[PDB]
Write a protein that binds this ligand. Sequence first.
Ligand SMILES: NS(=O)(=O)c1cccc(C(=O)CSc2ncccn2)c1
Ligand SMILES: NS(=O)(=O)c1cccc(C(=O)CSc2ncccn2)c1
Ligand SMILES: [Zn+2]
Ligand SMILES: [Zn+2]
Lengths: 259, 261
Amino acid sequence: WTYFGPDGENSWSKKYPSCGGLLQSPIDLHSDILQYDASLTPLEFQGYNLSANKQFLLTNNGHSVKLNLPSDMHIQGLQSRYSATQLHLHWGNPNDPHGSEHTVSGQHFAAELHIVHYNSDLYPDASTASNKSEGLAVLAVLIEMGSFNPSYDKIFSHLQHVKYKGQEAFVPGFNIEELLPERTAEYYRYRGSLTTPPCNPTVLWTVFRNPVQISQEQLLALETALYCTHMDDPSPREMINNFRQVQKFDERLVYTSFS
Amino acid sequence: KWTYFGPDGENSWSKKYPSCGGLLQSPIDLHSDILQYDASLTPLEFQGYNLSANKQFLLTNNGHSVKLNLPSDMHIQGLQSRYSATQLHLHWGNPNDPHGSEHTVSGQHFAAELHIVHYNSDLYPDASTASNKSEGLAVLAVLIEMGSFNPSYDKIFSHLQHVKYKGQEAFVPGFNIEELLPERTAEYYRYRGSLTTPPCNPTVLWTVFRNPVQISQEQLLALETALYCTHMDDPSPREMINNFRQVQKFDERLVYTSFSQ
Ligand SMILES: NS(=O)(=O)c1cccc(C(=O)CSc2ncccn2)c1
Ligand SMILES: NS(=O)(=O)c1cccc(C(=O)CSc2ncccn2)c1
Ligand SMILES: [Zn+2]
Ligand SMILES: [Zn+2]
């Protein structure tokens, strides 16, 4: 599967039936579908300050760049405890640097970070959790152009060692909480899916209301570093526009922690 | 069959209609990064749009939209070939989210969208043979927003409660179709794309007018609530709502504009 051409997103449903099933993400966050829920409590991020003496595997999986995260990282504030598994990014392209997955009032942001967690009270690991009830919880951070961000540079500075699919490098531990915005207590919450194949309708989404900033140069670096193909592919393809279009969202509601 | 909701909705069109997964797909979001002014883009001329009030035209609930048949003497001039009218129809949302245009502008969905469909009659016999052939189709798009009552749109809308179910027809006396067009029709977006409905043929030259028209809250609600996708006999009716396609990726391409910004 890809994001462009014949095996692009309108064809995902052929090999991956859930990509044309229920609860699909991402969506456009707009007033007609929002409802304040005063019961939603702020999340607490535990174990996110990773030891500088430990290291963490960065991988180009052919679709994005992922960081592996340890199952001792947890979020509190959902009904079950959810432990971390990986984080990754979605982005656009230099001529159109508007590649977030979720939109707000129809507007794309430059990019989007996802911090993926699985239900560790119910399930032993992420792979088992991925296609089961209540299995996954993703945190989403919207990214715009702004000031240089030292914390996102903790990922971006390694990008030239993972240029082709399958390549790996280690990244020393850093504080994952520095990737999060201001006032995390304000967010949108809804039931949805993976935004790539296999598109399992098994995800609890929390999209923070406030965006972070990365510089133009950091954004351009991310847009131009990577390839979807293996180092010996005779038809190389750049890793750009790796985001899904927003999905229909009807007779259903997104809940907000802010009124 | 195909729908806009459930197992047969738009993510699964590609399974029965392989062009829906192919190149050049519409609709799109019209936004600054992909727009460029083209000064060679001249006004279209609308000929035979003033339909005979002594003639009647067939309006049809086809299970996916409400469609008005148009005569072959109606046409657009100004493109390389003459394109002759075949039909017009609409796309809308629903009363809880009344934002069902197909094209969007700077991420803005309008309330609804009118399409006036033409075929290249210099090169081909009729619309169905023009359909899957190169530069076979041209479509005019009007973006609709909620506001003032519109007498000309009501020439169509006043029939809606008499075509509520699939297969039903009414007769509409001729009126001036140019009166469905917005102000300053010389200002438009232009690009190569596809039919927005299966079989999604990548054969459409698009013209989307810059300026929206308005219809009243009452007219928009009648459009959103009058009609069903299913036959009159159906024990389980399905409402004809949300009959618009999501915007499509549009990468390394350009939409040209006849107005400058
Ligand atoms: N963009 S996303 O966070 O919804 C996303 C898409 C696909 C996989 C993931 C994961 O974190 C791994 S869960 C998984 N991976 C492969 C196959 C099945 N599930 C996240
Ligand atoms: N929404 S649209 O203007 O792009 C559109 C949708 C569906 C059909 C049509 C036509 O009538 C073109 S002729 C045709 N109709 C159905 C199938 C194939 N060709 C136009
Ligand atoms: Zn993701
Ligand atoms: Zn149409």
